[PDB]
Amino acid sequence: QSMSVKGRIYSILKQIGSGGSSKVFQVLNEKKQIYAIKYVNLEEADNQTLDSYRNEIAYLNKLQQHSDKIIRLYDYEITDQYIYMVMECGNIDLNSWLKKKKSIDPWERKSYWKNMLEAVHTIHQHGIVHSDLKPANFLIVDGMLKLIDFGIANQMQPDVGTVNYMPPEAIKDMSKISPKSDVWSLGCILYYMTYGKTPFQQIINQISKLHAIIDPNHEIEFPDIPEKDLQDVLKCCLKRDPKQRISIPELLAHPYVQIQT
Ligand SMILES: COc1cc(-c2cnn(C)c2)ccc1Nc1ncc2ccnc(-c3cnn(C)c3)c2n1
Numbered sequence: 407q408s409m410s411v412k413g414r415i416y417s418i419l420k421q422i423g424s425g426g427s428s429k430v431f432q433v434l435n436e437k438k439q440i441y442a443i444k445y446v447n448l449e450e451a452d453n454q455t456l457d458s459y460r461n462e463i464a465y466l467n468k469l470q471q472h473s474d475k476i477i478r479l480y481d482y483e484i485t486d487q488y489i490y491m492v493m494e495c496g497n498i499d500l501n502s503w504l505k506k507k508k509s510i511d512p513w514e515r516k517s518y519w520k521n522m523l524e525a526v527h528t529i530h531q532h533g534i535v536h537s538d539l540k541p542a543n544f545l546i547v548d549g550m551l552k553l554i555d556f557g558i559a560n561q562m563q564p565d566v567g568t569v570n571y572m573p574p575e576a577i578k579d580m581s582k583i584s585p586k587s588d589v590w591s592l593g594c595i596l597y598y599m600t601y602g603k604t605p606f607q608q609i610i611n612q613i614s615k616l617h618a619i620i621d622p623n624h625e626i627e628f629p630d631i632p633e634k635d636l637q638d639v640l641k642c643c644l645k646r647d648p649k650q651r652i653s654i655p656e657l658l659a660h661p662y663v664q665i666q667t
Contacts, residue, residue, distance in 0.1 A: 409433070409443065411483045411490045416443060422495075425562030427451065432495055441480070442496070446489035446560075459489060462559040465534060472532075475525035477545055477552045496545035496552065500595075502564055504541055510599050512633065513666075518599070520663050521551035522592055527654045529556065530585045537583050539591035540571045541598075569612060570594065570604035574620045574646045586648035589657070593643025600636060601629065605644060622646055635662035 407418045409431075416433040419440075423430040427447040434440060446459060463484070469476045481492035500518075504510075522544065529536060536543070538557030545552050561567065573590035575582035598604050605626045609615045618624040626644055631637055639662045642652040657663065 409445075409490070411443065411492050412481050414481070414492075416441065416492075421565050423562040423564050426560045428560050428562060430562060440495045442493045444489070444491040444493060446491075447487070448485075448489060449487055458558045458560075462556055463489075463491070465529075465532070465556055468532065469528060473524060473528040475521055475550075475552055476528060477547070477554050494547055494552075496547040498546050499542055499554070499564065500544040500546060500551065501541035503546055504598065515596075515599050515636075516663060516666070517549075518551045519596055522553075522595065523654055523657055523663065525551070525553035526588050526592060527658065529553070530588070530654060535583055535585055536588050536591075537573075537576065538571075539588055539595070540568060541595055569615060570607060572616070572619060573648070575648050577616050577620050582648070584648055585654065586651045589643055589651050589654060590648075593640060596636075596643065597640055600631065600640065620646070633662070635660070635665070638662070 409416050409418065414435065416435055419432045419434060421429055421431050422442060427450060429445045431443050431445065432440065433443050448456065448459075451459075463479075463482060466476065466479045467482075470479060477496070478494040479491060480494070483490040525544075526536070526539070534556060536557050542561070543554055543557065545554050571591040571594040573583075573587040575584070575587055594604050606615050606618050609618055628637055628641055639657070639660060642657075645651040652660075
C-alpha cells in the first residue's frame, strides 16, 4: 500500500505506531529516502480535538528553524477528513528504548539530557509549557534525542497513561503550572535513567502516589553515585517548591551537562 502527500507518493514499509484516531507509518519516497508519516483520521473528530491538532502542527512548524532538537516536519496535508504529516523517521522512542536497556552508559545519559534540555528550553522560549513530559515524548534520531509533541493532540503506542512524572503544582491546584513544572518531569526522566525507577514508582495506589508527590514530609531517596554532579542535578530538579526548583537556563550552565568525567 501507498499514500500521497502534496503530490508526492510514499510507499508504506511498516506501521510504527497507533493511538486513538492516529497511526504512524515508516515510509519511502521515490528516491528511496525514509520518513515517518503521521496519519490522523478526522472523520469522528470534534472541534476540541481539531483545535488540539491545529495547535500542535503550528508549533512544530514554527519551532523547526529554532532548534534541531525538535522533530523535523517536512510537509503536511490537512483536509476535513484527515491529516498527513511527513516527518523524519527515528530509530525508536525513548520509553521503548529505556525498557530494553539493562544499563545506560553515563556518556549517553548526559548527551540525551542535554538534548532534552535544549528541546524543552526552545518550547519555553515561545511560551509553551508541555506539562506532560514523559520518555514517550522523545525520539532517538541518529543518537540524538528530539521532542515529538507538546502532549496536546494524542498519545501513541508502538505496534495506559502514567502519573509518575506529574509535578506537585499540578495536583495542588485541583494556575501554578510554569516552565519549572517541566523541570520536575525532566528530573523524573533523568532519575529513572540514573536509579532505574521514577521517584515514586514504588507506591501502587495512585491516590497515595499523588499524595506522596505533594507531601514535603515524604522524602525522595537519592542513593550515592560516582557522578556527584548528577546527584546534585537530580536534587535541584526534584524540589517540590517550584520557586526553589532550578530552571532550564540554569541547568544548561550546570557542571553535569557542561563538564565531562
Ligand atoms: C522505526 O521507527 C520507530 C520505531 C519505534 C519502536 C520500535 N519498537 N518499539 C517498541 C517502538 C518507535 C518510534 C519509531 N520512529 C518514529 N519516527 C518518527 C516518528 C514521528 C512521530 N511519531 C513517532 C512515534 C510516536 N510514538 N511512536 C511509538 C512513534 C515517530 N516514531
